[PDB]
Design a protein around this ligand. Sequence first.
Ligand SMILES: [Zn+2]
Lengths: 102, 104, 159, 75, 187
Amino acid sequence: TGMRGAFGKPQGTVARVHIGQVIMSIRTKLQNKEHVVEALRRAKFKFPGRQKIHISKKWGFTKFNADEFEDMVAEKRLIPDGCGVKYIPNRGPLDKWRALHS
Amino acid sequence: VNVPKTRRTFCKKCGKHQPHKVTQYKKGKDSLYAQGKRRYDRKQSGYGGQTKPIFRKKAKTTKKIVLRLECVEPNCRSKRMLAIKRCKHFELGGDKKRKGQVIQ
Amino acid sequence: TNTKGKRRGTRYMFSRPFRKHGVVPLATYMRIYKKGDIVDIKGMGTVQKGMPHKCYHGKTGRVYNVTQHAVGIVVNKQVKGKILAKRINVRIEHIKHSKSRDSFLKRVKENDQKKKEAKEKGTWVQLKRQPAPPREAHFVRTNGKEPELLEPIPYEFMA
Amino acid sequence: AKSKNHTTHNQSRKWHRNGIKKPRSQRYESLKGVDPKFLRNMRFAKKHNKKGLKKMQANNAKAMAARAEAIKALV
Amino acid sequence: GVDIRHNKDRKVRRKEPKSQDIYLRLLVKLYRFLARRTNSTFNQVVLKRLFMSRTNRPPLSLSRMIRKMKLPGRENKTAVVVGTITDDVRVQEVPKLKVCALRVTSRARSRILRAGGKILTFDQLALDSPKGCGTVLLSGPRKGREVYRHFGKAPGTPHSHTKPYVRSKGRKFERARGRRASRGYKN
RNA sequence: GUCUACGGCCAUACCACCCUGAACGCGCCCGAUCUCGUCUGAUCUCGGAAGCUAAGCAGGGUCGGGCCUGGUUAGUACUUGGAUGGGAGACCGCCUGGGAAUACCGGGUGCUGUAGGCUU
RNA sequence: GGGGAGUUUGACUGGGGCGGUACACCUGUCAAACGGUAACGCAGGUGUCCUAAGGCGAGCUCAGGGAGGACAGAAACCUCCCGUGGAGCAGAAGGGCAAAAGCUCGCUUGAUCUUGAUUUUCAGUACGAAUACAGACCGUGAAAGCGGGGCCUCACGAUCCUUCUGACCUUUUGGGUUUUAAGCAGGAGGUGUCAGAAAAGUUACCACAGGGAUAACUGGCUUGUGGCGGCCAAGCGUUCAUAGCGACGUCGCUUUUUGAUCCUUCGAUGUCGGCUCUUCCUAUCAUUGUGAAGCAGAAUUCACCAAGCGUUGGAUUGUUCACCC
RNA sequence: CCGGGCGUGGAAUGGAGUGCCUAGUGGGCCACUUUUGGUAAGCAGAACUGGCGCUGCGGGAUGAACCGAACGCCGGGUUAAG
RNA sequence: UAGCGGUCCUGACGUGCAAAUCGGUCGUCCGACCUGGGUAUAGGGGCGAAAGACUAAUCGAACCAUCUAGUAGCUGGUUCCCUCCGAAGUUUCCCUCAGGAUAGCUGGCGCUCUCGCAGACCCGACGCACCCCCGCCACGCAGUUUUAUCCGGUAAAGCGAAU
RNA sequence: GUCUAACACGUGCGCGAGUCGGGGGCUCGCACGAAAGCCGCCGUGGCGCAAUGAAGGUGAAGGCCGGCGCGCUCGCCGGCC
Ligand SMILES: [Zn+2]
């Protein structure tokens, strides 16, 4: 306070960004291409500084890429289950389930 | 702490381990005279002054207890002195604790 | 910040690495140390009796005393700008040999054998360790194709 | 009053101005701190070495003759 | 500007050093010529010593001279000293030999001439032999003086063995603490 | 091939489950007077040798987990050294050298000293 | 026995014995992959405790979970299975440990006597603490071995003086004997300002040496707090986001507030407010010229160019500030 | 421990080793990079290296530190930062 | 009113007429009044209708002389020329923080060897000279890279790896 | 700013197992001299050649080997270095 042992005490709580972070991801129907960026550009005016906006090259919040994702799902290596899709390698001990029905 | 009254250990005069009886130490008073006390008196003598510096700012709350060992061999009178780490309580040869049966 | 403490900042140093928290494998006990071969000092943690101080964790120096189950070691401690040749005791669980000298001894043996063989053949070969010279002039055969055309990648965004 | 605390940086050049760097090595050195049992025993060996010369040299005149002859007798 | 460092520019081993009375100065004016124009490293070293100060040319005790000249292979050779020769009373055997030193004490000179040897002054030596020709060269001990037992590791360190400066040797002078573990600690 | 006692490395040796068994080799297994110790001959200890390899143990199987070792991750992240390089800043590019770790995709799944057997 | 006298009345310190020990200590971190390292930097602990919580030797495995069993239940006690330290190691935290360093027993005092060496902090001085050997007496275990305090890192102390134990010790003054005294060794009595003075205030009656190395003013750097705006636009404005405003956010400016700092003067810059006088700035209360409006007129509100010219008379306080006719 | 036989081993530099006596200092400051306290400070506190201190010259107009740069007295030529 | 005082102008002068005076306006002016001379009280002492006032232009302890040049970690200064070398502001301890001690950094005096006056002869996987070193240690060192072998746990990265 | 005296330390200059006129004394000779020269003084004595103990005190080298003493640890003459 009078600097005779000055050291602050907790107040507020922030998050640290990194060049290339992803502060907000919106998912919707492809028809809403110009609603997504239109709305999301507002957040550029609430956050400090400049933040490039961007349209993902992925199906959703998945690890995956352009819509060959769904081809892979047809191949059954990707299982639609929950807000994301569960990956499946060809490892594992179900070499009788993959027989009975893959 | 606590220590039993009788324990065997090296009796220097004997030359071997022998049993010893332990009595905890307490200070003396004056030989009858001692030239320290004698000069201190003749220095206090005369008009004025407290010559040798009295000691008032105390800071220690326990004295280094000391055990006095007596031999027991007939005509091995010897008595030898030994120390122990500090302590805020002391007992001697008291009631020993058996465990595994303790009730609050 | 703190000052004197026999083991400061040895939370990770003496820590029995990242899976081997077991008892001491016995070969470290069973190794034969002699008077005057270069050990090196890496402190363990399980021994609990006789550790070198953390100033000597990693240094390496001659050995000059051999007790029952702990050797003395002469190592160079760095202090203010003088360098001291200090002597210590270390339980043998913290020391180990150091190939630094052993490789030199092997190459000594090959040098002397080569000298003897030069005695036998009359020809003076080059004795050890001429340092690494620059490259020689060699022909690169290109039969198989004409070289690959290599060209920069245009920018793309992967957030 | 108030004083300003230290700052410790020039004491790195201070040494190297002309500071030595080696412990002044030497050949065989002072047996101070060796295992005293070994010390006693090795001393007995030494005392009966520089005694026992009608032991030592009278049982090494043989090896003197032997090497001093053989080092040529290879020829 | 070069980056050399200058603190060792000048060598302190001085070249024409302290040379103050005319006899020694003239001896130097003689051996300088020999040092220049004779490859005899012996003359180099002898002249290099004719500069030193007396605390660096201690007196060659005659007993030392005897037991260093007796050694095998050193018969009929002049033994040369740059310091001076003081006779010893530790020796009863009359000498046997021939010297060549700057200054020799009267007792030692008496006993040498009685022995039937010779005394050679450096001019006599130079005209005898323009260089080291069968000449042994000695020196009185130069770690002899007292102050060396004062020098060294400062006393009070764990394993000095040096002599402090105290004004007597009585029991009460320094032997109080830092000397006997009955009084606080020992060296 | 393989086992037994002591081991060194201490997971390529662990864990799970199924199959296989080149002496009495280990072991299960039958008893408790002697030795011994427990509330219990379960354990420990002793004395045995009727059956047993059902178990341990050894070997094998596993689109096995684990573990070891490779790739892809990447010359990316990172940094020694340089500039009167950009930027208002936050940061960043370059010259020069060094150069990783996940996710993911391969491969492997005890070796071996010593003294001692057998080929069920 | 302050009637009278002598003297003392710690240091650190974002100015000042106010607060607090950063004054001896030890752990984790800062601390930048030797390893040293700073602040009244951050999270913490100590002035003890233990006849065993020491030393050996043997035997068992802990935390918790799952299925069962009369009372019995969420939890007593018994049994089976899973069980990589998830528990316990006297206490802070870190390290370390699974036929142990834990748990239970069994026996015991190596928690003893005696030289030297080394580490730890550093002048490579001591104290403290620790390392590894050697010479004795021992302990346990069949034995190999292990043990000279606590599983390791903290848990404690100089000269002088006092006190105790030690040898059939030396001296006790011309000699002898005996008391007593001084010696020599090892422990203890303590110095927490923890390398170790014995110590209460007040000076507005004050003094001398100094200090801008250090406060109280202006002046500088900063602008958190103070004041002035700007951006985004859910809403208020019956209808309507922007006539006029503006929340949740965010970017600046100004030095007309208050702080933070110590750079300049302590061998001196006269430090509140008021009175008188000049001049300056503009983010404009009024006036000249203009746009806008939820603007009919009248008033009034927002904004633009703009400091040429105005911005009062009094009650109350010293008032700056305020308040009222 | 005594005797015997074989010589020196990677580049680049250069003479090393050793003793005695001893004045001044123990108020620092700044900068590239790393880093703690703070909102930040021409603020407080740390590591490395270099400077200012103790030092002038050209250049940044002006200046303690920045850039170049290191000094006896001069003539000729050539540059660095500019 | 004289006499005695000395309120307000915060009037005058403020290197003054004056080391405290002047002009006006002010309180008292028969009582605890004003005043000359004599006499007493003396420095930790007197004297005080009490302000620490007065004690010779000095008083919360006068003046003079001596001890005496008291003492200082504190400011001030510390006198001729050139030449050579050239820092520290950090460690530890201190009633230590504007100071010393100690280390470090500094200069001076030197020393022990190198052996480049190294002929009229004659080599090193040891340097120098090279006639060649009988006389010769190329011995040694490094704020450096190289080749080996070691040590750590920051940057970076991870949570479908424990906390 | 060792200013001067007294210490002490080390370096340097000059005289040795010693060194030293240090205080006294002697020539009478006193301008120069309060000096200079001389000594059973030659040195009582300082400092040194000898340390250590608290103090009684003790205080600096062995080797070969002849025998007898069991060469037994060892001793006594031995001859020698
Ligand atoms: Zn006894």
